[PDB]
Amino acid sequence: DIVLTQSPATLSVTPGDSVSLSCRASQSISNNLHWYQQKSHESPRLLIKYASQSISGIPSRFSGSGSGTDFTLSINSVETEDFGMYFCQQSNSWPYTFGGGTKLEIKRADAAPTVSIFPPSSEQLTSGGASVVCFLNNFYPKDINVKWKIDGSERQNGVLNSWTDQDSKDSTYSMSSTLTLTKDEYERHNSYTCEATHKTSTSPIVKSFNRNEC
């Protein structure tokens, strides 16, 4: 199967600026490379077909170029409605295949997350369960590292994370991290920590609590 590799994985841009997205094929595919845009909760939309042919109805700022194994989607002056996912797809050989996609995101000023930690509720403990929750809200860029520590030891098992899409309100990102244990596990330890490392500071933001208090 032909493998399509897209880069960068993510591209941050300020509306008004021009950008170029790359798609490389593992084998020559002539001009049989198509570009698709896909926004949150929407279906894919064909932008350019056969490497550089325009699709009647698509904004002129979108143009494609390249041939063989190297293709480029260019967006002259990215606009507010242009942020989302972009995928390339080849039709030269069956099966048709898609690239991994490039996420076009809105560039804004860096912002540190607002971190909050919460202990298991009395209700959940009664059910024999124990989830420790940590919210990391309104930060930018999206790159962030969250580490959980129990009694000073890093804990990876039982951790589940959820991320929101870039915020339509302020273009930031938010994340929820939950460490789930059994009630017996939870009551066995004392300190619970949510540690977030973000570009905004060389020192991680630490939120924690000890059962030996409150």
Added chain:
Amino acid sequence: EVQLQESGPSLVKPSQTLSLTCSVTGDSIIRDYWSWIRKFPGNKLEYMGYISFSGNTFYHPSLKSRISITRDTSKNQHYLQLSSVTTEDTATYYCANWDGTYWGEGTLVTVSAAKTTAPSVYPLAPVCGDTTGSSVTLGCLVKGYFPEPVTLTWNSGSLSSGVHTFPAVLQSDLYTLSSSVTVTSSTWPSQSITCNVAHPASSTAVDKKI
């Protein structure tokens, strides 16, 4: 006014068959080639196959012999059938014309052996019940429900600002979702803040005061 409407069971059990119908209106099935594409949870697209004007089909070898694409020229619909599914077949399925100029709305088909299960709603409040600073963030943990979705509101909707409701994640075959709400320190605990969670599938609605 060409439109493609997808329809089919949104929930299928492992080893069963997933079925989707693409109803075409404002155009005729015999007037084009038709395709099926799926998008996995992590934004990975896979071209499943297409059926030409002559009825010939082309299937992606990744699907082994589990896929079947057929059409009904009298009903102006084409269908996708995928047998012996597993949780890995959970995805958003799309139909489109081969030209890629017309696409269906997209239907999320979930493969799971889970049975309808009402959610447990847990309040998230600061450890010492004490606030620190000009604001306070509270939360709601909706754990162990199936299938999606659940609707979550704060104070029946009267509290709509500073809210962050995160996409559900799969935890032991069941869904878990959380929501954070941030208010000024003068608002809580001065005023009551309640998490309202409705889960239609289980005919349940619960209110949890923080």
Added chain:
Amino acid sequence: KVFGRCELAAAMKRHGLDNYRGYSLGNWVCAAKFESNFNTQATNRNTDGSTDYGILQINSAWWCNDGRTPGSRNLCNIPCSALLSSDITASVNCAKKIVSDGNGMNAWVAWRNRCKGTDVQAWIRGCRL
């Protein structure tokens, strides 16, 4: 316009026909030669009221719409006139869709009767591609 052999080869190569769905460039140059002698304006009227258009003689009953063909399906979603342009863009796009049908280049009788099973590579040999 009437293309020179190598000229069309270069153009078809640029239009991604070299190895499209397993068919080498020569197959397309050969098909074009026998279908229309590389003439983009070639037309052929059929008994069923349909007409074949362009360098690859694509039919108006199944592939393009000329506004006057009984039971036109317009599978290529294009006016047949687009197939008469000196710009081969539309003819190539449509040819690709046709070949994507279960029968490959067998859709073209001329290719079947004069190019199939032959050293089609001979059609581009000599050209500087």
